[PDB]
Amino acid sequence: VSGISAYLLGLIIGDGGLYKLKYKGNRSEYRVVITQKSENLIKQHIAPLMQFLIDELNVKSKIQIVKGDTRYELRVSSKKLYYYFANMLERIRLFNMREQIAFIKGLYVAEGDKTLKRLRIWNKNKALLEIVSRWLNNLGVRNTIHLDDHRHGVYVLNISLRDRIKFVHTIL
Known part of the structure; x- marks a missing residue:
């Protein structure tokens, strides 16, 4: 629940x-x-x-x-x-921990690469991505954030590639 x-x-x-x-x-x-x-x-x-x-x-x-x-x-x-x-x-x-992972799973299921060739999450709200980024670092998944669309201010969160299995492993 x-x-x-x-x-x-x-x-x-x-x-x-x-x-x-x-x-x-x-x-x-x-x-x-x-x-x-x-x-x-x-x-x-x-x-x-x-x-x-x-x-x-x-x-x-x-x-x-x-x-x-x-x-x-x-x-x-x-x-x-x-x-x-x-x-x-x-x-x-x-x-909490179970909620953080759940949140992140829906974020990636929402707009993420089901192929997993690309591991990205986008949002115009940087402050939210950063709290997400800290949640990922906490589970040992390396990730980076950086303004993607400057005109419209859409930031992107990238999951490091040397940690692909780690991400699927942790969010599942």
């Missing part, structure tokens, strides 16, 4: 998001989203995990899977769920 949550939040941060969207007038909608190219990844892997959490937290919201062109989206319009993840992201620094 702690691992699942951290994992899902890694997926949401990697490629998805937490949104408060306008419905009508001053009413807003609290939407938790996770995008993944592969329909079955969401279908046979991510949905089950979210359903469990959803049910564990007593969110009456249902999961909806929308197919955009090329990619799929998993949505859950829930104020409680949105906030549940909001606080998790606030106290990320207090993440």
Whole structure:
């Protein structure tokens, strides 16, 4: 439950998001989203995990899977769920060991090279990557961070190559 949550939040941060969207007038909608190219990844892997959490937290919201062109989206319009993840992201620094690994696994599953020829994680939020970088060093995986897209300020986290097995070995 702690691992699942951290994992899902890694997926949401990697490629998805937490949104408060306008419905009508001053009413807003609290939407938790996770995008993944592969329909079955969401279908046979991510949905089950979210359903469990959803049910564990007593969110009456249902999961909806929308197919955009090329990619799929998993949505859950829930104020409680949105906030549940909001606080998790606030106290990320207090993440325990099992949560840190889970978080990192979702971050790489979100936008990482499934081929493992390239081991990178990208984010416009440097401060988050650095706390991730420290989590990796702590598990003995060598890694580097450096501004990738300067115009849009997107930093990249690279896992040293002489530590590829170490990474898959530690995050699994």
